Amino acid sequence: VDDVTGEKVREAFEQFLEDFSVQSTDTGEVEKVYRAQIEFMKIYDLNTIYIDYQHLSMRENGALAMAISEQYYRFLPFLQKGLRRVVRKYAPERVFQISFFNLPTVHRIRDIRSEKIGSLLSISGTVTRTSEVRPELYKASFTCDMCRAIVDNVEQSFKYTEPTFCPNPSCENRAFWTLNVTRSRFLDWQKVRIQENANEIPTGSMPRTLDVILRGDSVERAKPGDRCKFTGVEIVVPDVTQLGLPGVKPSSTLDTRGISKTSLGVRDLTYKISFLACHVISIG
C-alpha cells in the first residue's frame, strides 16, 4: 500500500517532469524547461535542481500537490531515487539536492504547531549570529575487527548509530567499531539562529528566536541583518535541559511480558522544535 503509494507518488512525479514543462508559445519559451534544467546543469555540473511549485500545482489539479505538502519527511528517498533514474536515462559521483520555490503561503513563528511537522510552511525573519562551516558525515564505514571491516552503511539519519546488526562477517550484532575516517562522502553546513520580525510582534511580547541549519549548497547564502524566505520543511531536535519543567515525562520502558525468564536500561525523551531548509531567497 504505502510501498506502492509513495512509489506511485514517485512514478507520477517521474511522469510529471518527463512531460512538457511550459505551455507558452514561440513568443517565450516553448517546451522542455525541466529537460533543459539537467542539460544546462550538464554544462556546469553543480548537481542540484531548481524546480517550481507552481507548475506542480497545474497538472494533477492539486491532488498531488496535496499529497506532498503534508508528509515530506515520509517522502525523502522516493523523490530522490526516481530522479536518479531520470538522470541516467539522459545523462551520466552523482549526489543530489532538491530545492523548491514559490510557496503561495508564508507564516510566522507564532503560526507553527507540532501538527505542522513534516509539512511545508514558509517563515521569514531576522538573521542573527551566523556560525562557521563544519562537516557532516552521513556515510559510516564502521565494522569490527572481524574480516569484513568495509561496511559503508547507516547513520545517514540524525543518530550516531554506525553498526548494522546482521553482517556476514565473523562479527556479531553486538560487535561494533569506529568509522573509517577516509572513505566516505560528506557535506558541510553552517548554523544561524534567526530572530522574528519586529513588524509582527504583538503587545507585551518580545521577538523570538529559532535555530536553522543550511546544509550543502545553501551555506554562505545567509547574511546577518537580512530578510529571507525559506524552504517549507521542518524538523525536530532532541533537547536536554527541559527537566523539572514540569510535566508528565514520557519514557521508553520496553516490554518484559515476552520471553520467559528464570536490568533497567530504559530511557526518556524531551525534544524541541527546530527548523531545516534548503532554499533561501533573500528578498527583503
Partner 1 sequence: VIIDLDDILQYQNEKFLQGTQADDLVSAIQQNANHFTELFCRAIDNNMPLPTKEIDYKDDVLDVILNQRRLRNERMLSDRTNEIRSENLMNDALREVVEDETELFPPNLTRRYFLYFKPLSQNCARRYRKKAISSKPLSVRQIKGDFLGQLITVRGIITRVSDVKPAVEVIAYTCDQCGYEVFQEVNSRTFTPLSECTSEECSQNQTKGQLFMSTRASKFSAFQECKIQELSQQVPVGHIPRSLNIHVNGTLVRSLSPGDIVDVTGIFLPAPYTGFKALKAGLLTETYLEAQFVRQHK
Partner 2 sequence: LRIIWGTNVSIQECTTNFRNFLMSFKYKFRKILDERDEELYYIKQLNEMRELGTSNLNLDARNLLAYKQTEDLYHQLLNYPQEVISIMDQTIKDCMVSLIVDNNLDYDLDEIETKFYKVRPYNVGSCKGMRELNPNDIDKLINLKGLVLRSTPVIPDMKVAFFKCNVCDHTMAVEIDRGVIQEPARCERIDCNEPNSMSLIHNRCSFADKQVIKLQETPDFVPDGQTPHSISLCVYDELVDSCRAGDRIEVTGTFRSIPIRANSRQRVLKSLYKTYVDVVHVKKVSDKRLDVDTSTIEQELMQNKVDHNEVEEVRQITDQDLAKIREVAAREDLYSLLARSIAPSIYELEDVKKGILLQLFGGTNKTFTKGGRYRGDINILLCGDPSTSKSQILQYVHKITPRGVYTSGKGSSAVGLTAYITRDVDTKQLVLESGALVLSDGGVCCIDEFDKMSDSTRSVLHEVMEQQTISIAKAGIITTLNARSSILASANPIGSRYNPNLPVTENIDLPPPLLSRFDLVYLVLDKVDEKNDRELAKHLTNLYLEDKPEDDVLPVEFLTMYISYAKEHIHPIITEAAKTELVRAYVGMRKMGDITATTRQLESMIRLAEAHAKMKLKNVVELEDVQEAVRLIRSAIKDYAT
**Residues making contact with partner 2 (CB under 8 A):** 2, 71, 73-74, 110-115, 117-118, 126, 128, 157, 164-166, 173, 195, 198, 200-208, 235-236, 238, 240-248, 250-255, 258-259, 269, 271-273
Of residues 32 and 110, the one with the C-beta less far from partner 2: 110
CB 62 → partner 1: shortest distance, Å? 47
For the record, the C-alpha cell of 271 comes out as: 525534544
Of residues 133 and 243, the one with the C-beta less far from partner 1: 243
* CA–CA–CA angle 201, 207, 209 (5° rounding): 135
Give residues in contact with partner 1 (CB under 8 A): 253, 256-257, 260-261
Buried b (16+ CB within 10 A) or exposed e, 91-121: eeeeeebbebeebeeeebbeebeeeebbebb
Residue 203 interacting entry, from partner 2, partner 1, none, C-beta within 5 to 8 Å by type: partner 2
Of residues 63 and 166, the one with the C-beta less far from partner 2: 166
Q: Is 50 left (phi over 0), alpha (psi -120 to 50) or beta?
A: beta
Residue 1 interacting entry, from partner 1, partner 2, none, C-beta within 5 to 8 Å by type: none
* CA–CA–CA angle 197, 203, 208 (5° rounding): 35
CB 68 → partner 1: shortest distance, Å? 41
Of residues 204 and 247, the one with the C-beta less far from partner 1: 247
**Any long-range contacts for 156-160 (C-beta under 8 Å, 24+ apart)?**
158/235, 158/237
